[PDB]
Structures are given as structure tokens and as C-alpha cells.
Ligand binder design. Structure first.
Ligand SMILES: *[C@@H]1O[C@H](CO)[C@@H](O)[C@H](O)[C@H]1NC(C)=O
Ligand SMILES: [Cu+2]
Length: 235
């Protein structure tokens, strides 16, 4: 159970984005239904009044929280991977539009899941803004908590992989469009019951064996990291 507070650009806090430049849902409940329109940008997908200006090569940092800013972030039980996607705003995230800019699942050296390192990072994870066409974009940040992912929601609706999905409205101003955006996957649609990484038993299967859901990260990406860029407590 987690939500996005706002973003940072190049290490500079852009301010509370909830219902402003983040298409925020009303609470931190997960999405579980892989076929639901809620997979696109969570349960209150509508245009919000602001879009954060960035340029290609900027660092865009999402900042998550549980109940209040810079708290425990997400329950430690919610082991799983983190991904970020991009699509043009004109799509409203419909169709074959979502391109992956970032993936982190399990780090064998540190023996930590992406979620574990998100907590250590005070909720902060980043991508580098790609050289796509200037214009309006949706950046879709996705945490998958696997603690009840031994079951499929479609079979048992009180269990399943949990998706914490947040869409940020981002305007890319300066870009040479040297890496124009390639075809995307649909959400809902890309994840199915047979997709690698959707049904997994983190209690019995070694984390080293985990494979995150495709698609692969676009070669045009520059992303990106799970790491604290800014100290929220100084404000
Ligand atoms: C899952 O989403 C689909 C598409 O909106 C819907 O038809 C189905 O009823 C949903 N399942 C549940 C259990 O609500
Ligand atoms: Cu939760």
C-alpha cells in the first residue's frame, strides 16, 4: 500500500503533485485485476491541471509514501519489482503505447528486491528523460508486490500480485527527437496469468530465479536507479 507524493527534476523537488500533476487515486489500495482499465493509470484516470516541464537528459525522480511523506514508504512484506513506462499524452494510455524505460527486480549482490531498496531510498526512484519528440507524456511508475502472488487474482480474487500504479503528467520541452518513441504495449493487456513474474512464490522459489514481466527495457532508455536524490525532511 503506497502512493506517489510528487517528483523531483535534477534533484529539485517539484512540490506536492497529488491530483495536480499526478493522476492520484483516492487511497493506496492495490490494483489486482490484470484485465481492468485500472491497470492503465489506477482507479481515477483523468487529466489533472499541471504537467511537469523537463528536458531530454534530465533525471525524473518519483517519490512514494505509505500514509505520510517520507514514512515507512511501503510495508517490507511487499517484496517485488519496479518498472517505469512512458506513453504520449494524446493516447490517454489506451492502445499499444507504453514503452519501458526502467526495470529492477532482484539484486543478487545485496540480496534485495527493488521494493526493499525503495524503502532504503525514502521512496525515491528515477529515470533519465529520453530523446523523444517534444510534447506531453504520461510516465507510469509500477510497483508489483509479490507477497500473495502464489495465487492468480483471476482464480482467487482475495489473493494475487498487487500493482501500485501511478501516472505523472510530464512535458518534454527541449529534445532533439533523435530516439523517437517505438511501439508500445497495452495496459491492460501486456500482463496475463501466464506472463513470467505475475504468479511467483517468493517463500519457496529463490529470488535469483525470478523473471520480471516483459516487455524488455527499450534500447533508447537512459534510466535510471532506485536511490535517494533529495531530502524531503529539509523542507
Ligand atoms: C476484472 O476486470 C474486467 C474488465 O473491466 C471485468 O469484466 C471483471 O468483472 C473484473 N473482475 C472482477 C472480479 O471485478
Ligand atoms: Cu499493501
Amino acid at each position: 500500500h503506497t502512493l506517489v507524493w510528487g517528483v523531483w527534476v535534477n534533484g529539485v523537488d517539484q512540490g506536492d503533485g497529488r491530483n495536480i500533476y499526478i493522476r492520484s487515486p483516492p487511497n493506496n489500495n492495490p490494483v489486482k485485476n490484470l484485465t481492468s482499465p485500472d491497470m492503465t493509470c489506477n482507479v481515477d484516470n483523468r487529466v489533472v491541471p499541471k504537467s511537469v516541464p523537463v528536458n531530454a537528459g534530465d533525471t525524473l525522480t518519483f517519490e512514494w509514501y505509505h500514509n505520510t511523506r517520507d514514512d515507512d514508504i511501503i510495508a517490507s512484506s511487499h517484496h517485488g519489482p519496479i518498472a517505469v513506462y512512458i506513453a504520449p499524452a494524446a493516447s490517454n494510455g489506451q492502445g499499444n503505447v507504453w514503452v519501458k524505460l526502467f526495470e529492477d527486480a532482484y539484486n543478487v549482490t545485496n540480496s534485495t528486491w527493488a521494493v526493499d531498496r525503495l524503502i532504503t531510498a525514502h521512496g525515491q526512484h528515477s529515470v533519465v528523460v529520453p530523446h523523444v519528440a517534444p510534447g506531453d507524456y504520461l510516465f507510469r511508475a509500477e510497483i508489483i508486490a509479490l507477497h500473495e502472488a502464489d495465487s492468480l487474482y483471476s482464480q482467487n480474487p482475495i489473493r494475487g500480485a498487487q500493482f501500485y500504479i501511478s501516472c505523472a503528467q510530464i512535458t518534454i520541452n527541449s529534445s532533439d527527437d533523435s530516439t523517437p518513441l517505438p511501439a508500445g504495449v497495452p495496459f491492460p493487456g501486456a500482463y496475463t496469468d501466464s506472463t513470467p513474474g505475475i504468479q511467483f512464490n517468493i517463500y519457496t522459489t529463490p529470488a535469483t530465479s525470478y523473471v520480471a514481466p516483459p516487455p524488455s527495457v527499450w534500447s533508447g532508455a537512459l534510466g535510471g536507479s532506485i536511490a535517494q536524490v533529495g531530502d524531503a525532511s529539509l523542507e
